[PDB]
Amino acid sequence: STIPSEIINWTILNEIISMDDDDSDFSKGLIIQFIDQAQTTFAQMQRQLDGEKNLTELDNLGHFLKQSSAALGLQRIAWVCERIQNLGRKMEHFFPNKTELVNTLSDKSIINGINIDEDDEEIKIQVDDKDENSIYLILIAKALNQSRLEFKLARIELSKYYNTNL
């Protein structure tokens, strides 16, 4: 499947533009909660990659954040989390380069002010025929770097539509 080109699904973009004051405050609270959730989630995935390397936990973490991001329309985060899930389940063996995924952005402008590697963490896991999990862990590490960028881009977008720094 292909990563969506828009950061926010148009369903949710319509709601944002149409919401009254009560619904807008409520949705803003949801987003603030999601931001704290995703930062906890990413840091738990990083600690796994650096420590126990439990693929089952990495899968559960991606499953959890796919749902919370998708419910807010943040479909690119959701797509990457789905890759992490399926890599953790050993059902995928591929994760696209950052240049390919950035190139799919429908709005070429949200990149140019940003260091897209700023939130990267070095991938220290080696391919090893004695560790059947090594390849999946390396691809999850790549996907986590993509996630952190998609997360920063989603925050920049949401900040524009809610007129405050989220």
Residue numbers in the entry: 2 to 167
Quote the study's own text.
Histidine phosphotransfer (HPt) proteins allow bacteria, yeast, and plants to expand beyond canonical two-component signaling pathways into multi-step phosphorelay pathways. The pathway consists of the transmembrane HHK Sln1, the HPt Ypd1, and the RR proteins Ssk1 and Skn7. The HPt protein (or domain) acts as an intermediate in the signaling pathway by transferring the phosphoryl group from the HHK to a RR, which elicits a cellular response to the detected stress.
The X-ray structure of the Ypd1-G68Q mutant was determined in order to ascertain structural integrity of the mutant and to gain insight into its loss of function characteristics. The Ypd1-G68Q mutant protein crystallized in space group P3121. Clear electron density was observed for the side chain of the glutamine substitution at position 68. The root mean square deviation (RMSD) for all residues between the Ypd1-G68Q and wild type structure is 1.9 Å. The area around the site of phosphorylation is unperturbed with an RMSD of 0.2 Å for all residues in αC and αD helix. The N-terminal αA helix and the following turn (residues 11–21) show the largest shifts in the C-alpha positions with an RMSD of 1.7 Å. The αB helix is extended by one turn (residues 22–26) in the Ypd1-G68Q structure. The αA helix rotates approximately 30° around an axis at its N-terminus and αA helix makes a ¼ rotation around its longitudinal axis. Upon the αA twisting movement, the originally exposed I13 and I17 become buried, while L14 and I18 are now exposed.
